């Protein structure tokens, strides 16, 4: 193994991270190789000790200091360089503050030496050549003070700070350690998500397109979520009513059943910048009014709103559901368990979002219109009864694009069949 600290600023140096004897046996060699070719340089020239790859960064007037990062590649290097740049900037600021303090001390010493030389000259004025060494020392101190002032001015033109820099360098390494092999993957995923959420559209032509399709639409955590979705009788109609848009409230006596409902909240699609403001878990409240005058996610204590009690659970249409519920429930009934179900659900959600986007585009670009829309839905986007959640997500994204986010609800006229047993 290797320690991702690289505390070596002397090489003749600071306990940061070390667990192998080779760590502080190749760190000195790396520091010496970095200081041999000495300014602001950064080089990573090989490594040793069973492939302990590292990366160095960095009598006389200055002190050669550097910071290493041993990690047993180019993407991670470019990722850590962004943080090491700020780390080196803070270190240079601290060094400039220390140099200013040393220059002030040297100026005070030079003033004291000049006063002593003046006193010696005044004492010797009452009696040949004397106080020559004192005058030479005063001149040398004045020259050193002038050089220090010039260096400080050049540094300005071109303690607490050290502790802050150390804490920053120690907290920035945690991300690189946790993403030693997924840093670039997460970066590209975030970039793609941003570039997909930013679309900004074209001109008044698309403005009128959106207005027309909106007018036409009007005149018509992970571990607990996997454990709950696995051991649950008749979970397919419950998740169908949850995803189709029907409010799925929970009813229980204790607080554990109400807290477990927050774990399964990674499947419900939001509608605005927030997710669910009226969320009163394990609290008796008149949810009869909030089920129609608030968001679609709320809980109420026991002692189109499908109620999920401690013994039974309602449903929107348990007679025939779509192929999405089995596709989402087969993961819980398989070996996939642990930090995988959340990513699978997110992938299925973005796939459904793209499907609803294509559905809207095809429905607006291709009684005759309803027939073509149903034909498109049956050809792709639905199999048996999944033509409702697709339209729900389509309407949601259409309202989100039109900068109109909810109190526009919708009633689905379907038999409840709240037995589910």
């Amino acid at each position: 193994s290797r320690d991702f600290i690289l505390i070596s600023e002397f090489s003749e140096t600071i306990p940061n991270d070390t667990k192998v004897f080779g760590t502080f046996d190749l760190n000195y060699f790396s520091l010496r190789i970095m200081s041999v070719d000495y300014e602001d340089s950064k080089v990573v020239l090989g490594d040793s000790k069973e492939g302990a790859f590292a990366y160095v960064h960095h009598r006389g007037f200055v002190r050669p200091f550097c910071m290493a990062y041993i990690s047993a590649i180019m993407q991670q290097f470019q990722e850590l360089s962004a943080e090491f740049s700020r780390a080196s900037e803070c270190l240079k600021t601290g060094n400039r503050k220390a140099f200013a303090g040393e220059l002030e001390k040297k100026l005070k010493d030079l003033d004291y030496t000049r006063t002593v030389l003046h006193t010696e000259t005044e004492i010797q004025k009452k009696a040949g050549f004397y106080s020559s060494q004192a005058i030479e020392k005063a001149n040398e101190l004045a020259s050193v003070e002038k050089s220090i002032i010039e260096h400080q001015d050049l540094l300005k033109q071109i303690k607490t700070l050290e502790e802050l820099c150390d804490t920053e360098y120690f907290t920035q390494t945690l991300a690189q350690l946790s993403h030693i092999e997924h840093m670039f993957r997460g970066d590209l995923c975030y970039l793609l998500t941003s570039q997909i959420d930013r679309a900004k559209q074209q001109h008044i032509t698309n403005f009128l397109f959106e207005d027309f399709v909106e007018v036409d639409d009007r005149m018509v955590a992970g571990q607990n979520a996997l454990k709950f979705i696995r051991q649950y009788p008749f979970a397919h109609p419950a998740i169908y009513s949850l995803l189709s848009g029907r409010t799925l409230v929970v009813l229980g006596e204790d607080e554990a059943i109400v807290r477990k409902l927050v774990t399964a909240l990674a499947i419900f699609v939001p509608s605005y910048g927030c997710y669910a403001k009226p969320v009163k878990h394990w609290a008796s409240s008149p949810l009869h009014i909030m089920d129609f005058q608030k968001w679609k996610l709320i809980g109420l204590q026991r002692v189109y709103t499908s109620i999920l009690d401690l013994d039974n659970k309602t449903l929107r249409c348990p007679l025939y559901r779509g192929t999405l519920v089995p596709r989402l429930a087969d993961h819980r009934t398989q070996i996939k368990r642990g930090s995988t179900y959340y990513l699978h659900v997110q992938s299925m959600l973005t796939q459904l979002c793209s499907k609803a986007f294509l559905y809207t585009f095809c429905h607006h670009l291709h009684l005759v219109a309803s027939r073509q829309m149903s034909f498109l839905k049956l050809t792709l986007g639905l199999v048996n009864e999944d033509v409702r959640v697709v339209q729900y997500l389509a309407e949601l994204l259409k309202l989100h694009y039109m900068q109109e986010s909810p109190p526009m609800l919708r009633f689905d006229y379907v038999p409840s069949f709240l037995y589910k047993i």
Binding site: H182, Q202, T340
Partner: protein, 356 residues
């Protein structure tokens, strides 16, 4: 342009300034190259290696190496600091080419092979390649593919299925016919590509080291030797996608990607259709990450037979495992490459290891 000057490290006694500049015969300033070579060779301690020197003071990214036999040697490539974001995506190919040209002549008994001018001759090719490598209106393409759906759409689906297979897992295509580089750019800036698919396809065609497109102006023949191409780098995720009229590629199959092409053809517009392909790439990367996580949470214990059971059980949760899972397996094998770790590597690469 990016290759300023190359050098050869001769560290027999102390140091040797064997510099071989580009566009000029030799063994920005004249002595600066020798000074940088001496600075890079001064840190060469006594025990095929690799190194890097991003010298921001003088502005020279000297990517030097360390070669061994009788004494210490090495190859150095001086490049200005203005191409920092340019040399990083091309470093994986440059280092491989340097290791390949340095391995020929690295033995213990006698490995001279007249290493006087052949090394400079081999480095000149890489210098010219790097100098040439430096420096698509789908509104009608999708419409034509939807109208015809016999030649263009079929060829696009075949190319995507070939690039979503193990034969062309990482941008496998060299040249087909003519000089129309529109299809190359289309395959680059879309799915079934890599740099975030922005710095993969470039110049320096005619069987380069590694890239995404080599669409040279081949109007007479392939401009390459088939046995030489099959003996040089055939054991690699690359294929010869012949898109002249209709021809599939291989490495001497329909999948779920056909639905994506069908949706692209049946979706009108194409003026701002980049969001759909972006979402497709996003869900593909999410599925690849899910697969690699499901593999890692089972191979972390280091048990070898546990990987086989995990791969067998993953077929139930995979949609159309086999033919359609080829792209997922290729992504899960190319993500880490770009006892537990050796077992995972052997599982992710079973037919790509016969390169001995």
């Amino acid at each position: 342009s990016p290759l300023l000057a190359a050098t050869f490290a001769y560290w027999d006694n102390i140091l040797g300034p064997r510099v071989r500049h580009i566009w000029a015969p030799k063994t920005l300033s004249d002595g600066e190259i020798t000074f940088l070579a001496n600075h890079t060779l001064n840190g060469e301690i006594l025990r095929i290696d690799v190194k890097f020197f991003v010298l921001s003071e003088k502005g020279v990214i000297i990517v030097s190496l360390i070669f061994d036999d009788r004494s210490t040697y090495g190859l150095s490539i001086i490049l200005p600091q203005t191409e920092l974001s340019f040399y990083l995506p091309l470093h994986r190919v440059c280092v491989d080419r340097l290791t390949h040209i340095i391995r020929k002549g690295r033995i213990w008994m006698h490995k001279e092979r007249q290493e006087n001018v052949q090394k400079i001759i081999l480095e000149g090719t890489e210098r010219m390649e790097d100098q040439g490598q430096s420096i698509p209106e789908e509104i009608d393409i999708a419409d034509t593919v939807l109208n015809d759906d016999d030649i263009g759409d079929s060829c696009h689906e075949g190319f995507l299925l070939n690039a979503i297979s193990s034969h062309l897992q990482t941008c496998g295509c060299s040249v087909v016919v003519g000089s129309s580089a529109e299809k190359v750019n289309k395959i680059v800036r879309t799915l079934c590509l890599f740099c975030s698919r922005l710095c993969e396809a470039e110049s320096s065609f005619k069987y380069e080291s590694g890239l995404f497109v080599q669409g040279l102006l081949k109007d007479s023949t392939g401009s390459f030797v088939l046995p030489f191409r099959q003996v040089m780098y055939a054991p690699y995720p690359t294929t010869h996608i012949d898109v002249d009229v209709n021809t599939v590629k291989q490495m001497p199959d329909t999948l779920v990607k056909a639905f994506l092409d069908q949706v692209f053809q049946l979706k009108p517009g194409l003026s701002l259709r980049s969001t759909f392909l972006a979402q497709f790439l996003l869900v593909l990367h999410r599925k690849a990450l899910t697969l690699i996580k499901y593999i890692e949470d089972d191979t972390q214990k280091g048990k070898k037979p546990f990987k086989s059971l995990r791969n067998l059980k993953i077929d139930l949760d995979l949609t159309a495992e086999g033919d359609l899972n080829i792209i997922m397996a290729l992504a899960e094998k190319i993500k880490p490459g770009l006892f537990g770790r050796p077992f995972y590597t052997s599982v992710q690469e079973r037919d790509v290891l016969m390169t001995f």
